mmCIF file of C-alpha atoms and ligand atoms in Angstrom:
data_model
loop_
_atom_site.group_PDB
_atom_site.id
_atom_site.type_symbol
_atom_site.label_atom_id
_atom_site.label_comp_id
_atom_site.label_asym_id
_atom_site.label_seq_id
_atom_site.Cartn_x
_atom_site.Cartn_y
_atom_site.Cartn_z
ATOM 1 C CA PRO A 1 83.259 101.866 98.616
ATOM 2 C CA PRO A 2 85.212 104.127 101.013
ATOM 3 C CA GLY A 3 83.266 106.273 103.483
ATOM 4 C CA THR A 4 82.365 109.954 103.145
ATOM 5 C CA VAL A 5 84.564 113.050 103.009
ATOM 6 C CA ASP A 6 84.004 115.630 105.751
ATOM 7 C CA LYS A 7 86.439 118.533 105.983
ATOM 8 C CA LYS A 8 87.919 117.193 109.210
ATOM 9 C CA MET A 9 89.449 114.522 106.948
ATOM 10 C CA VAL A 10 90.679 116.796 104.171
ATOM 11 C CA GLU A 11 92.548 118.639 106.919
ATOM 12 C CA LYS A 12 94.496 115.606 108.113
ATOM 13 C CA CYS A 13 95.105 114.839 104.471
ATOM 14 C CA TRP A 14 96.911 118.143 104.204
ATOM 15 C CA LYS A 15 98.904 117.835 107.405
ATOM 16 C CA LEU A 16 100.298 114.660 105.826
ATOM 17 C CA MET A 17 101.152 116.207 102.492
ATOM 18 C CA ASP A 18 103.114 118.751 104.529
ATOM 19 C CA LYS A 19 105.026 116.072 106.392
ATOM 20 C CA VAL A 20 106.129 114.474 103.092
ATOM 21 C CA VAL A 21 107.220 117.811 101.718
ATOM 22 C CA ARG A 22 109.429 118.420 104.784
ATOM 23 C CA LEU A 23 110.899 114.869 104.621
ATOM 24 C CA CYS A 24 111.574 115.189 100.872
ATOM 25 C CA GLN A 25 113.087 118.653 101.125
ATOM 26 C CA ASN A 26 116.009 117.336 103.111
ATOM 27 C CA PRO A 27 119.236 118.510 101.504
ATOM 28 C CA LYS A 28 120.693 114.987 101.836
ATOM 29 C CA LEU A 29 118.030 113.515 99.556
ATOM 30 C CA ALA A 30 119.173 115.902 96.877
ATOM 31 C CA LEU A 31 116.101 114.777 95.039
ATOM 32 C CA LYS A 32 116.508 115.117 91.322
ATOM 33 C CA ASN A 33 114.697 118.184 89.922
ATOM 34 C CA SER A 34 113.443 115.957 87.093
ATOM 35 C CA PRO A 35 109.802 114.888 86.760
ATOM 36 C CA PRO A 36 107.905 113.395 88.361
ATOM 37 C CA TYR A 37 108.893 115.978 90.960
ATOM 38 C CA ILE A 38 107.187 115.390 94.254
ATOM 39 C CA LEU A 39 108.168 118.754 95.728
ATOM 40 C CA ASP A 40 106.052 120.432 93.040
ATOM 41 C CA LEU A 41 103.355 117.755 92.791
ATOM 42 C CA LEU A 42 102.134 117.895 96.377
ATOM 43 C CA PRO A 43 101.859 121.700 96.656
ATOM 44 C CA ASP A 44 100.111 121.634 93.285
ATOM 45 C CA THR A 45 97.690 118.959 94.405
ATOM 46 C CA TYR A 46 97.024 120.781 97.614
ATOM 47 C CA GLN A 47 96.226 123.856 95.609
ATOM 48 C CA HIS A 48 93.751 122.071 93.327
ATOM 49 C CA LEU A 49 92.061 120.493 96.335
ATOM 50 C CA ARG A 50 91.477 124.068 97.528
ATOM 51 C CA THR A 51 90.202 125.058 94.095
ATOM 52 C CA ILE A 52 87.777 122.141 94.314
ATOM 53 C CA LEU A 53 86.813 123.035 97.876
ATOM 54 C CA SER A 54 85.950 126.598 96.893
ATOM 55 C CA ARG A 55 83.704 125.544 93.997
ATOM 56 C CA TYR A 56 81.753 123.435 96.490
ATOM 57 C CA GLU A 57 81.132 126.105 99.112
ATOM 58 C CA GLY A 58 77.404 125.655 99.582
ATOM 59 C CA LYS A 59 77.315 122.227 98.010
ATOM 60 C CA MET A 60 79.863 120.698 100.395
ATOM 61 C CA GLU A 61 77.425 117.886 101.089
ATOM 62 C CA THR A 62 77.084 116.655 97.520
ATOM 63 C CA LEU A 63 80.888 116.754 97.256
ATOM 64 C CA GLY A 64 81.295 114.369 100.181
ATOM 65 C CA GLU A 65 78.995 111.837 98.481
ATOM 66 C CA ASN A 66 80.947 111.877 95.203
ATOM 67 C CA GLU A 67 82.297 108.344 94.832
ATOM 68 C CA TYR A 68 85.325 109.389 92.850
ATOM 69 C CA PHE A 69 86.317 111.984 95.431
ATOM 70 C CA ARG A 70 85.966 109.504 98.307
ATOM 71 C CA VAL A 71 88.217 106.959 96.585
ATOM 72 C CA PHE A 72 90.694 109.698 95.651
ATOM 73 C CA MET A 73 90.931 111.238 99.100
ATOM 74 C CA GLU A 74 91.457 107.790 100.548
ATOM 75 C CA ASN A 75 94.189 106.911 98.087
ATOM 76 C CA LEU A 76 95.841 110.282 98.646
ATOM 77 C CA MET A 77 95.886 109.634 102.386
ATOM 78 C CA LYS A 78 97.122 106.067 102.020
ATOM 79 C CA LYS A 79 99.896 107.016 99.643
ATOM 80 C CA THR A 80 100.898 110.026 101.689
ATOM 81 C CA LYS A 81 101.224 107.703 104.725
ATOM 82 C CA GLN A 82 103.054 104.973 102.796
ATOM 83 C CA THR A 83 105.595 107.673 101.858
ATOM 84 C CA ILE A 84 105.973 108.931 105.399
ATOM 85 C CA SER A 85 106.386 105.432 106.749
ATOM 86 C CA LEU A 86 108.866 104.726 103.962
ATOM 87 C CA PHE A 87 111.152 107.429 105.344
ATOM 88 C CA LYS A 88 110.615 105.868 108.780
ATOM 89 C CA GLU A 89 111.938 102.444 107.756
ATOM 90 C CA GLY A 90 114.581 103.613 105.347
ATOM 91 C CA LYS A 91 116.305 106.124 107.583
ATOM 92 C CA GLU A 92 119.950 106.666 106.735
ATOM 93 C CA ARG A 93 119.392 104.786 103.524
ATOM 94 C CA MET A 94 117.141 107.423 102.028
ATOM 95 C CA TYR A 95 120.334 109.460 101.615
ATOM 96 C CA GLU A 96 121.996 107.369 98.860
ATOM 97 C CA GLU A 97 120.303 107.608 95.448
ATOM 98 C CA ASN A 98 120.380 103.894 94.550
ATOM 99 C CA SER A 99 118.721 102.539 97.702
ATOM 100 C CA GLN A 100 115.568 100.475 97.589
ATOM 101 C CA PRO A 101 113.945 103.012 99.881
ATOM 102 C CA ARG A 102 114.872 105.710 97.349
ATOM 103 C CA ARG A 103 113.628 103.530 94.522
ATOM 104 C CA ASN A 104 110.245 103.153 96.181
ATOM 105 C CA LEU A 105 110.129 106.920 96.740
ATOM 106 C CA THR A 106 110.543 107.377 92.986
ATOM 107 C CA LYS A 107 107.687 104.987 92.226
ATOM 108 C CA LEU A 108 105.541 106.949 94.630
ATOM 109 C CA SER A 109 106.541 110.243 93.041
ATOM 110 C CA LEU A 110 105.155 108.880 89.793
ATOM 111 C CA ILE A 111 101.891 107.862 91.446
ATOM 112 C CA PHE A 112 101.464 111.381 92.792
ATOM 113 C CA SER A 113 102.022 112.666 89.272
ATOM 114 C CA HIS A 114 99.296 110.333 88.046
ATOM 115 C CA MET A 115 96.815 111.236 90.770
ATOM 116 C CA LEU A 116 97.148 114.931 89.985
ATOM 117 C CA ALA A 117 96.671 114.420 86.254
ATOM 118 C CA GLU A 118 93.568 112.383 87.148
ATOM 119 C CA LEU A 119 92.233 114.976 89.575
ATOM 120 C CA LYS A 120 92.787 117.819 87.113
ATOM 121 C CA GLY A 121 91.047 115.911 84.319
ATOM 122 C CA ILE A 122 88.040 114.837 86.408
ATOM 123 C CA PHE A 123 87.682 118.147 88.295
ATOM 124 C CA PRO A 124 88.852 120.623 85.668
ATOM 125 C CA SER A 125 88.778 124.106 87.184
ATOM 126 C CA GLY A 126 87.426 122.544 90.388
ATOM 127 C CA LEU A 127 84.121 121.227 89.133
ATOM 128 C CA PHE A 128 83.194 117.573 88.870
ATOM 129 C CA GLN A 129 82.899 116.540 85.207
ATOM 130 C CA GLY A 130 83.632 112.833 85.431
ATOM 131 C CA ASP A 131 80.172 111.700 84.357
ATOM 132 C CA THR A 132 80.683 113.607 81.086
ATOM 133 C CA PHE A 133 84.421 112.827 80.642
ATOM 134 C CA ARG A 134 85.138 111.898 77.033
ATOM 135 C CA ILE A 135 87.009 108.700 76.242
ATOM 136 C CA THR A 136 89.120 109.635 73.268
ATOM 137 C CA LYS A 137 88.428 106.367 71.480
ATOM 138 C CA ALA A 138 85.110 105.598 69.915
ATOM 139 C CA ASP A 139 85.227 101.809 70.574
ATOM 140 C CA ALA A 140 86.681 102.182 74.035
ATOM 141 C CA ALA A 141 84.025 104.774 74.931
ATOM 142 C CA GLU A 142 81.279 102.357 73.812
ATOM 143 C CA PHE A 143 82.797 99.761 76.027
ATOM 144 C CA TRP A 144 82.870 101.934 79.076
ATOM 145 C CA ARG A 145 79.431 103.231 78.218
ATOM 146 C CA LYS A 146 77.896 99.836 77.673
ATOM 147 C CA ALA A 147 79.508 98.267 80.714
ATOM 148 C CA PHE A 148 79.699 101.111 83.245
ATOM 149 C CA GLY A 149 77.360 103.957 82.280
ATOM 150 C CA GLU A 150 78.508 107.328 83.586
ATOM 151 C CA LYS A 151 80.476 105.858 86.459
ATOM 152 C CA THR A 152 83.709 107.795 86.777
ATOM 153 C CA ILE A 153 85.415 105.025 88.710
ATOM 154 C CA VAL A 154 84.984 101.217 88.896
ATOM 155 C CA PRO A 155 86.617 98.560 91.111
ATOM 156 C CA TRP A 156 89.263 96.413 89.483
ATOM 157 C CA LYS A 157 87.228 93.264 90.074
ATOM 158 C CA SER A 158 84.321 94.728 88.061
ATOM 159 C CA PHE A 159 86.510 96.198 85.393
ATOM 160 C CA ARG A 160 88.433 92.887 84.945
ATOM 161 C CA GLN A 161 85.209 90.925 84.634
ATOM 162 C CA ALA A 162 83.752 93.391 82.145
ATOM 163 C CA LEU A 163 86.777 93.610 79.905
ATOM 164 C CA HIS A 164 87.237 89.846 79.969
ATOM 165 C CA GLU A 165 83.997 89.279 78.038
ATOM 166 C CA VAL A 166 85.333 91.119 74.933
ATOM 167 C CA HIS A 167 89.072 90.683 75.232
ATOM 168 C CA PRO A 168 89.622 87.449 77.176
ATOM 169 C CA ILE A 169 92.159 87.481 80.007
ATOM 170 C CA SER A 170 93.520 83.935 80.195
ATOM 171 C CA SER A 171 95.282 83.896 83.593
ATOM 172 C CA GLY A 172 95.639 85.649 86.949
ATOM 173 C CA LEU A 173 99.215 86.397 85.949
ATOM 174 C CA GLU A 174 98.093 88.221 82.769
ATOM 175 C CA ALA A 175 95.417 89.995 84.783
ATOM 176 C CA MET A 176 97.963 91.085 87.363
ATOM 177 C CA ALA A 177 100.193 92.452 84.627
ATOM 178 C CA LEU A 178 97.256 94.231 83.009
ATOM 179 C CA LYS A 179 96.233 95.810 86.332
ATOM 180 C CA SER A 180 99.874 96.876 86.634
ATOM 181 C CA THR A 181 99.683 98.934 83.444
ATOM 182 C CA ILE A 182 96.211 100.546 83.750
ATOM 183 C CA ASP A 183 95.960 101.128 87.449
ATOM 184 C CA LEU A 184 98.155 104.257 87.396
ATOM 185 C CA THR A 185 97.090 105.580 90.775
ATOM 186 C CA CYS A 186 97.479 102.134 92.361
ATOM 187 C CA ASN A 187 94.205 102.157 94.302
ATOM 188 C CA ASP A 188 92.440 99.049 92.956
ATOM 189 C CA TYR A 189 89.950 101.088 90.959
ATOM 190 C CA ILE A 190 89.945 102.002 87.285
ATOM 191 C CA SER A 191 88.879 105.516 86.354
ATOM 192 C CA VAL A 192 87.514 106.610 83.038
ATOM 193 C CA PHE A 193 90.680 108.737 82.999
ATOM 194 C CA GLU A 194 93.048 105.735 83.312
ATOM 195 C CA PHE A 195 90.887 103.734 80.935
ATOM 196 C CA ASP A 196 91.248 106.466 78.308
ATOM 197 C CA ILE A 197 94.976 106.739 78.708
ATOM 198 C CA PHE A 198 95.447 102.959 78.380
ATOM 199 C CA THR A 199 93.158 102.533 75.368
ATOM 200 C CA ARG A 200 95.014 105.339 73.641
ATOM 201 C CA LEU A 201 98.450 103.792 74.268
ATOM 202 C CA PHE A 202 97.312 100.362 73.058
ATOM 203 C CA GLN A 203 94.892 101.089 70.257
ATOM 204 C CA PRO A 204 93.238 99.896 68.120
ATOM 205 C CA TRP A 205 90.615 98.726 70.613
ATOM 206 C CA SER A 206 89.649 95.852 68.323
ATOM 207 C CA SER A 207 93.029 94.171 69.015
ATOM 208 C CA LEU A 208 93.733 95.743 72.451
ATOM 209 C CA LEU A 209 95.088 92.999 74.701
ATOM 210 C CA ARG A 210 96.895 91.643 71.635
ATOM 211 C CA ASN A 211 98.571 95.038 71.187
ATOM 212 C CA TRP A 212 99.633 95.506 74.793
ATOM 213 C CA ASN A 213 101.039 91.958 74.949
ATOM 214 C CA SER A 214 103.170 92.630 71.833
ATOM 215 C CA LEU A 215 104.287 96.164 72.642
ATOM 216 C CA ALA A 216 104.548 96.176 76.403
ATOM 217 C CA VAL A 217 104.871 92.728 78.067
ATOM 218 C CA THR A 218 107.219 91.077 75.585
ATOM 219 C CA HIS A 219 108.917 93.914 73.746
ATOM 220 C CA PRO A 220 112.579 94.553 74.583
ATOM 221 C CA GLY A 221 111.936 98.125 73.458
ATOM 222 C CA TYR A 222 109.400 98.960 76.157
ATOM 223 C CA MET A 223 110.868 101.088 78.967
ATOM 224 C CA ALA A 224 107.653 102.107 80.736
ATOM 225 C CA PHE A 225 108.148 105.528 82.393
ATOM 226 C CA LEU A 226 111.426 107.201 81.469
ATOM 227 C CA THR A 227 112.790 110.688 81.609
ATOM 228 C CA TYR A 228 114.553 111.829 78.473
ATOM 229 C CA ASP A 229 117.929 112.015 80.167
ATOM 230 C CA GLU A 230 117.242 108.432 81.220
ATOM 231 C CA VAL A 231 116.591 107.467 77.597
ATOM 232 C CA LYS A 232 119.788 109.135 76.393
ATOM 233 C CA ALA A 233 121.737 107.335 79.125
ATOM 234 C CA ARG A 234 120.392 103.933 78.122
ATOM 235 C CA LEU A 235 121.145 104.448 74.391
ATOM 236 C CA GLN A 236 124.634 105.729 75.070
ATOM 237 C CA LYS A 237 125.613 102.092 75.514
ATOM 238 C CA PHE A 238 124.758 101.816 71.814
ATOM 239 C CA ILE A 239 125.877 105.132 70.428
ATOM 240 C CA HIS A 240 127.999 103.288 67.809
ATOM 241 C CA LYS A 241 125.224 101.068 66.554
ATOM 242 C CA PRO A 242 122.843 102.979 64.291
ATOM 243 C CA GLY A 243 119.264 101.783 64.500
ATOM 244 C CA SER A 244 119.204 101.053 68.209
ATOM 245 C CA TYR A 245 115.958 102.320 69.716
ATOM 246 C CA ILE A 246 113.868 102.191 72.896
ATOM 247 C CA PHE A 247 110.377 103.507 73.529
ATOM 248 C CA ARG A 248 108.900 104.968 76.715
ATOM 249 C CA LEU A 249 105.992 106.675 78.455
ATOM 250 C CA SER A 250 106.213 110.191 79.820
ATOM 251 C CA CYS A 251 104.655 111.282 83.025
ATOM 252 C CA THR A 252 104.077 114.777 81.547
ATOM 253 C CA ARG A 253 102.270 113.558 78.409
ATOM 254 C CA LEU A 254 100.002 110.719 79.431
ATOM 255 C CA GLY A 255 98.593 108.676 76.587
ATOM 256 C CA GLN A 256 101.515 109.178 74.223
ATOM 257 C CA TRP A 257 104.658 107.212 73.319
ATOM 258 C CA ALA A 258 108.097 108.645 72.755
ATOM 259 C CA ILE A 259 110.652 106.751 70.659
ATOM 260 C CA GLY A 260 114.373 107.263 71.250
ATOM 261 C CA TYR A 261 116.912 106.178 68.659
ATOM 262 C CA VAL A 262 120.475 106.222 67.443
ATOM 263 C CA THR A 263 121.338 107.685 64.089
ATOM 264 C CA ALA A 264 124.180 107.002 61.775
ATOM 265 C CA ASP A 265 125.867 110.175 62.985
ATOM 266 C CA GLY A 266 126.131 109.035 66.534
ATOM 267 C CA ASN A 267 123.240 111.030 67.851
ATOM 268 C CA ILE A 268 120.357 110.149 70.075
ATOM 269 C CA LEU A 269 117.099 111.650 68.853
ATOM 270 C CA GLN A 270 113.500 111.246 69.863
ATOM 271 C CA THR A 271 110.161 111.491 68.110
ATOM 272 C CA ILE A 272 106.509 111.356 69.272
ATOM 273 C CA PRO A 273 104.286 109.192 67.076
ATOM 274 C CA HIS A 274 100.827 110.835 67.039
ATOM 275 C CA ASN A 275 99.118 109.688 63.876
ATOM 276 C CA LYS A 276 99.027 105.885 64.202
ATOM 277 C CA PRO A 277 99.152 103.168 66.874
ATOM 278 C CA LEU A 278 102.685 102.556 68.157
ATOM 279 C CA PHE A 279 102.946 99.333 66.274
ATOM 280 C CA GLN A 280 102.561 101.163 63.000
ATOM 281 C CA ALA A 281 105.248 103.736 63.843
ATOM 282 C CA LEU A 282 107.455 100.773 64.743
ATOM 283 C CA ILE A 283 106.667 98.748 61.614
ATOM 284 C CA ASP A 284 107.312 101.875 59.503
ATOM 285 C CA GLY A 285 110.455 102.952 61.315
ATOM 286 C CA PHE A 286 111.767 99.491 60.608
ATOM 287 C CA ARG A 287 110.958 99.577 56.884
ATOM 288 C CA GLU A 288 112.618 102.997 56.781
ATOM 289 C CA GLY A 289 115.729 101.709 58.556
ATOM 290 C CA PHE A 290 115.528 103.705 61.771
ATOM 291 C CA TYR A 291 114.124 101.348 64.392
ATOM 292 C CA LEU A 292 116.159 98.144 64.007
ATOM 293 C CA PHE A 293 117.533 96.935 67.328
ATOM 294 C CA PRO A 294 115.232 97.259 70.306
ATOM 295 C CA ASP A 295 117.391 98.172 73.324
ATOM 296 C CA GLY A 296 120.455 97.258 71.308
ATOM 297 C CA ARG A 297 119.269 93.754 70.523
ATOM 298 C CA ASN A 298 119.603 92.327 67.092
ATOM 299 C CA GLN A 299 116.388 90.422 67.145
ATOM 300 C CA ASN A 300 113.573 92.865 66.639
ATOM 301 C CA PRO A 301 109.973 91.652 66.889
ATOM 302 C CA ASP A 302 107.767 91.111 63.927
ATOM 303 C CA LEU A 303 104.784 93.266 64.537
ATOM 304 C CA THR A 304 102.965 92.735 61.319
ATOM 305 C CA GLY A 305 100.120 90.455 62.051
ATOM 306 C CA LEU A 306 98.854 93.129 64.305
ATOM 307 C CA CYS A 307 96.897 94.273 61.224
ATOM 308 C CA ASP A 308 98.116 83.157 64.487
ATOM 309 C CA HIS A 309 97.722 85.047 67.767
ATOM 310 C CA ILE A 310 101.041 85.317 69.660
ATOM 311 C CA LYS A 311 100.915 83.787 73.180
ATOM 312 C CA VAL A 312 102.801 84.707 76.344
ATOM 313 C CA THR A 313 104.635 82.643 78.962
ATOM 314 C CA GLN A 314 103.568 82.979 82.563
ATOM 315 C CA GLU A 315 107.227 83.819 83.182
ATOM 316 C CA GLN A 316 107.103 86.774 80.805
ATOM 317 C CA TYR A 317 104.196 88.105 82.902
ATOM 318 C CA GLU A 318 105.898 87.516 86.216
ATOM 319 C CA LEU A 319 108.998 89.350 85.015
ATOM 320 C CA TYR A 320 106.834 92.169 83.597
ATOM 321 C CA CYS A 321 105.118 92.719 87.001
ATOM 322 C CA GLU A 322 108.581 93.034 88.569
ATOM 323 C CA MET A 323 109.500 95.597 85.998
ATOM 324 C CA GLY A 324 108.100 98.777 87.528
ATOM 325 C CA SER A 325 109.189 98.547 91.147
ATOM 326 C CA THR A 326 111.867 97.278 93.432
ATOM 327 C CA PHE A 327 111.934 93.530 93.682
ATOM 328 C CA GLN A 328 111.505 93.790 97.455
ATOM 329 C CA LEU A 329 107.895 94.723 97.193
ATOM 330 C CA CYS A 330 104.794 92.576 97.076
ATOM 331 C CA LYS A 331 103.227 93.227 93.653
ATOM 332 C CA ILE A 332 99.785 92.526 95.116
ATOM 333 C CA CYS A 333 99.704 95.420 97.577
ATOM 334 C CA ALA A 334 102.715 97.301 96.257
ATOM 335 C CA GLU A 335 103.034 98.345 99.903
ATOM 336 C CA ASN A 336 104.833 95.702 101.977
ATOM 337 C CA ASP A 337 107.932 93.593 101.317
ATOM 338 C CA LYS A 338 107.565 90.005 100.143
ATOM 339 C CA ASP A 339 108.044 87.497 102.943
ATOM 340 C CA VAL A 340 106.467 84.252 101.769
ATOM 341 C CA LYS A 341 106.778 81.874 98.810
ATOM 342 C CA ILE A 342 104.050 79.534 97.569
ATOM 343 C CA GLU A 343 104.700 75.980 96.489
ATOM 344 C CA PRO A 344 104.511 74.712 93.865
ATOM 345 C CA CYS A 345 103.967 77.797 91.681
ATOM 346 C CA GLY A 346 106.873 79.727 93.174
ATOM 347 C CA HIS A 347 105.245 83.158 93.471
ATOM 348 C CA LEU A 348 106.332 85.707 96.032
ATOM 349 C CA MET A 349 104.179 88.100 98.086
ATOM 350 C CA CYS A 350 103.667 89.589 101.547
ATOM 351 C CA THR A 351 102.072 87.381 104.146
ATOM 352 C CA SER A 352 99.293 89.893 104.718
ATOM 353 C CA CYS A 353 98.019 89.803 101.087
ATOM 354 C CA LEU A 354 98.114 85.996 101.025
ATOM 355 C CA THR A 355 96.087 85.383 104.180
ATOM 356 C CA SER A 356 93.761 88.066 102.866
ATOM 357 C CA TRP A 357 93.151 86.269 99.568
ATOM 358 C CA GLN A 358 92.380 83.150 101.648
ATOM 359 C CA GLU A 359 90.093 84.897 104.158
ATOM 360 C CA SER A 360 88.093 86.201 101.184
ATOM 361 C CA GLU A 361 87.522 82.704 99.760
ATOM 362 C CA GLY A 362 90.028 83.336 96.975
ATOM 363 C CA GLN A 363 91.028 80.414 94.817
ATOM 364 C CA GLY A 364 94.494 79.202 95.737
ATOM 365 C CA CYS A 365 97.466 81.417 94.867
ATOM 366 C CA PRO A 366 96.611 85.126 94.632
ATOM 367 C CA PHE A 367 98.645 85.295 91.397
ATOM 368 C CA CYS A 368 97.913 82.202 89.309
ATOM 369 C CA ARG A 369 95.072 80.759 91.340
ATOM 370 C CA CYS A 370 96.829 77.429 91.365
ATOM 371 C CA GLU A 371 96.601 75.307 94.475
ATOM 372 C CA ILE A 372 99.107 75.903 97.232
ATOM 373 C CA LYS A 373 100.473 72.731 98.617
ATOM 374 C CA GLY A 374 102.726 74.714 100.811
ATOM 375 C CA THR A 375 104.371 77.991 101.639
ATOM 376 C CA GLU A 376 107.695 79.091 102.952
ATOM 377 C CA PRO A 377 109.324 82.200 104.441
ATOM 378 C CA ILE A 378 111.759 84.441 102.618
ATOM 379 C CA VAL A 379 113.659 87.561 103.576
ATOM 380 C CA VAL A 380 113.917 90.344 101.088
ATOM 381 C CA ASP A 381 116.288 92.686 102.843
ATOM 382 C CA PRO A 382 118.567 90.200 104.518
ATOM 383 C CA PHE A 383 121.317 92.563 105.509
ATOM 384 C CA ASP A 384 119.462 95.530 106.530
HETATM 385 CA CA1 CA B 401 93.562 103.474 89.923
HETATM 386 ZN ZN1 ZN B 402 101.227 92.306 99.564
HETATM 387 ZN ZN1 ZN B 403 100.892 81.283 92.012
#
C-alpha cells in the first residue's frame, strides 16, 4: 500500500501535470487532436481532482486514508513523471510522429484517458462511491464480492490468485498477457472499475478466460484500442474485398466493442454490438455474410464451441504482450527499455525488473518462471 495523501503532495502532482501540458503543447509535436487527447485529459483530470478536493473540505483526513485515492495519486504522479522524463530522453525525436518516443507518448495518453474514466466512475461528482460501485455482470459481481468484499482496488498478485481458482491461469506468460488487458491504468492494481470493463468485454463470465483467449490473444481481428480513422485506414488495404473486418476497443466507450467492415459497395462501415457477447455478433455476422476475413485474412476462426477447449502457444502470448506498446519497452514495468535476455527461455526485459524479481525470491524468469541458466545484454535503441 502507498502512503497517505496530504495536500502538499496533491500540489506537486499538479505542478507536474502542468509541465506535461507545456511539453505536449509544443507546435512541433503537432499532436493529433484525436482521442485519447492528452491536452484535454490532464486539464480535465486536474479539474475533477479539485471537485473531489472541495467535497472533502472538512473531511480531508478521511480522504487521505482512502486506499483507492492513495494508489491513484501515486500512479498519477508516476505516470506524469514517466511522461516528463520521456520528453527528456527523446528530445529532437519527439518531433517526428513515428518515433518510439512518440509511440510511448501515445500509450501514455491512453493511460491518462483510462485513469480519468476510473476516477470519474469511482468519485462521481467528487464523492467516493467505490465501495458501492456496481459490477455490471451478475456472475462477475459475485466473484468480486466473494473474493474481495467492498474493496475498490486490489493488488495484481491477489487478484491473479483469486481469479485463478475459478478460471485457471496456466502460465506466467498467460498471466502477463491477462494483466496486460485488465490493468488499464498500468499500476499493478485491479479496480472494481477495470474488473467491470474487462468482464463486460469478455462475457459470459462462465467461459471468461476461454473467451478472451479466442477473441483477443489469438484473433487476427482484434485491434485493441483504435480510433475510427485508424480503422478506416487499416481496411482501406482491403476496400476491394467485401467481408473484410476488424474489431477494436474505444477509449471513449469503455466496455464496448466496435466492428469495422467492408461492404460489397466498397464502403467501410462500423457497428457496435450491444446485445450479445462479441463472439455471438461475430458468429452471426459470419452466417449473414458480413464478417468473413479478419484483417483481410481468408482463414477466419471458428468461434462456435464458445457456447475441446482451444489452447494457446506461449509464443502467441509473448507476441500479444508486445502488441500494445513499442517493442523497446520492458513489458514488466512498461517503463524502461529492455536490456537483458534470459537463457534458455529467450524473454526480454529491463535489468531492473529482473534483479527485482530475484531479490523478492521470485521463481526463475519473471515471465515464464522457468529457470535461468544464463542472461545476456541487448541494446534496444542501437543507433540512437
Ligand atoms: Ca490498474
Ligand atoms: Zn522492466
Ligand atoms: Zn522466461
